[PDB]
Amino acid sequence: VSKKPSLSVQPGPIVAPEETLTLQCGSDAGYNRFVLYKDGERDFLQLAGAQPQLSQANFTLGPVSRSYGGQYRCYGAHNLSSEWSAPSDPLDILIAGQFYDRVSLSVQPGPTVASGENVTLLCQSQGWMQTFLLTKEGAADDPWRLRSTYQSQKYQAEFPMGPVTSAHAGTYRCYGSQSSKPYLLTHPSDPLEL
Numbered sequence: 001v002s003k004k005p006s007l008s009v010q011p012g013p014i015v016a017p018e019e020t021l022t023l024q025c026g027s028d029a030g031y032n033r034f035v036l037y038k039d040g041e042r043d044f045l046q047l048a049g050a051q052p053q054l055s056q057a058n059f060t061l062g063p064v065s066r067s068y069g070g071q072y073r074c075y076g077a078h079n080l081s082s083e084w085s086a087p088s089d090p091l092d093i094l095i096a097g098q099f100y101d102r103v104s105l106s107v108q109p110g111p112t113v114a115s116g117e118n119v120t121l122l123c124q125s126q127g128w129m130q131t132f133l134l135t136k137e138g139a140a141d142d143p144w145r146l147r148s149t150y151q152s153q154k155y156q157a158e159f160p161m162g163p164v165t166s167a168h169a170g171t172y173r174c175y176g177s178q179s180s181k182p183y184l185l186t187h188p189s190d191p192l193e194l
Contacts, residue, residue, distance in 0.1 A: 003029040004086040005076045009093065014135060014143065014175070014185060016096045018063050023072060023091065026056040031076030031085070033057070039071035039090060061093075069095040069183030096175060098184040101127025103176045105189035108158075113194065117164050121172060121192060124156045129176035129186065132157040137171035137191070145177070169194045 005027040015021045025034040030052035035044045036059045048057035055076075061068055071092055076085040108120035123132040134144040146157040161168065171193060176186035 002085045005074050005088045007074050007088045007091040014094050015064050023059040025074035027076050028054040031055050032079045033077045034074050036074045066095055094183050094185050096185045097187040099186040102187045103189045105174045105192045111193050119161045120158050123174035124154055125176050129155050130179050131177040133175040134159045135173045
């Protein structure tokens, strides 16, 4: 039970079917191998090797399907011993395009703005969704999960951005979600350009 490794995803936890995302299993505890597991699956998926001085191993999930949705963990080990590290923190991976119903991403004012404008891009759907995820073709770190409201025979959720800055003007996407299927997401909506 050594220092657990860290599991990150590039560029995000949301992957479309037939696509690829890479997982990084790294540590500063100087491991020389890492093993990737999927929570609730007996055999490990992959096993690699590294070189510390920190050490790292990349795992790639090739052309993904619905069944790739779930929780992943990795372990680190040293050269000689068979002692494997403590489990890493669980990585949630979600799969897009897994519902019949589709969602639409609109914008309250317009796609074109000068700084200080309050924009409120919307995410709608005729089909039932519990939560809507807002994401950005951006650099890093986490989708924005809001809960849905049934407005005008149409489920939706407003995403306030308030006073806008240059750091905002990227590419957007929203998804629909149901809690019965945690790691499954609706088809992405069309990109919205700011």
